Each structure stands twice: as structure tokens, then as C-alpha cells.
Design goal:
Length: 192
């Protein structure tokens, strides 16, 4: 709010609108690459560029609400940010699985998790001034329940890849083949 002026404009809401626009663009552009498992050089470059743009927008929102400023907290709460974040969850849940299947997309998958981490730190800074019955908490549980399937999928992803650090190097896999650098026949891997 540009106090003192007469036609104040909401830069925060405008940023939210641009984030929603780029989220819809990301959803369309990813979902276009459905069924086809080849990601060409253009499909990497034009895609990582939008990933970077979305990451920068998320960082801008994070700096908007980083201080415990209730005005911007409530402005973000009463906006279309929830649609953008549920769309981002929907794209993340499918793209992690799609990218983990094949190589030559490790950098793209890393950038996607980078955007996911920036998104989640924004969504967590959303709650740094939380109250036991705050409205932001209700809005966030509403977005979680309306996108339960995608967040369930990402939680399963994280749990599967977190149950791996201890499953291997704790009991038997560390001494299966104590030769040197990692060598496995991929059959003993499966049976282990």
C-alpha cells in the first residue's frame, strides 16, 4: 500500500498473478511432454529457462513475506497463490517420476528439485507468524487436502529415497562386494 498516494497498486498481488501465469505455462509445457520419453535439447533449454523464472518469482515472494509482515502475509493468503502452488505440486509429483526413469536428464531433474525447494521454503515462510487458529493454516490445509494425491506421491518419493541410505550401508550391502569403487552385478542388488 503506497500510503499517501491516491491510486495505490498491489505489486504483491501482481507478482502472484505472474507466478500463476508462469505456473499454468509450466503445467501446459510439461504435460505436452506426456507419453514421449525423449526430452530434446530445446525441451531442456526452453524448460530450464522457465524453471529459473519461476524460481526467481518464488524468491521474490519469499523476500516479500520473509519479515514477519502481517500485511503481505494476509495479502498472499487472500490471493490465487494456492492455485499456483497446487499446480506446482501436480507437476512436481509426475515430473520426478518421469525424470528418474532415464539418464541424460539429471541436470533438469536437479533444477526441478531446486525449484521445489525454493517453493517449499516460500510456503514455510508463509507460516513464520503462525497462530493456533490462524487463517493461513486453514488455507494451507485446504490446499493440501485438495492436492492430496500429488503430495502423497512426492511424500512416497521422498520416503523411498530416504529409506535407502540406511538400508544399504548398515548391515550387509557394505560388505557384499568390498573391492573398491562401487561395483554391483545388479542381481545381488535386487536380492539385497
Amino acid at each position: 500500500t503506497q500510503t499517501g498516494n491516491n491510486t495505490t497498486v498491489n505489486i504483491i498481488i501482481s507478482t502472484v498473478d505472474y507466478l500463476l501465469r508462469v505456473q499454468e505455462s509450466i503445467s501446459d509445457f510439461y504435460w505436452y511432454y506426456s507419453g514421449k520419453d525423449i526430452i530434446d535439447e530445446q525441451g531442456q533449454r526452453n524448460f530450464s529457462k522457465a524453471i529459473q523464472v519461476a524460481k526467481q518469482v518464488f524468491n521474490t515472494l519469499t523476500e516479500y513475506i520473509q519479515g514477519p509482515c502481517t500485511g503481505n502475509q494476509q495479502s498472499l493468503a487472500h490471493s490465487r497463490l494456492w492455485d499456483a502452488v497446487v499446480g506446482f505440486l501436480h507437476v512436481f509429483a509426475h515430473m520426478q517420476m518421469k525424470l528418474s526413469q532415464d539418464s541424460s536428464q539429471i541436470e533438469l531433474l536437479k533444477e526441478l528439485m531446486d525449484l521445489q525447494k525454493d517453493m517449499v521454503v516460500m510456503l514455510l515462510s508463509m507460516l513464520e507468524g503462525n497462530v493456533v487458529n490462524g487463517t493461513i493454516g486453514k488455507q494451507m490445509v485446504d490446499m493440501l487436502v485438495e492436492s492430496s494425491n500429488n503430495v502423497e506421491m512426492i511424500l512416497k518419493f521422498f520416503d523411498m529415497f530416504l529409506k535407502l541410505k540406511d538400508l544399504t550401508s548398515s548391515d550387509t550391502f557394505k560388505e557384499y562386494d568390498p573391492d573398491g569403487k562401487g561395483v554391483i552385478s545388479k542381481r545381488d542388488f535386487h536380492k539385497a
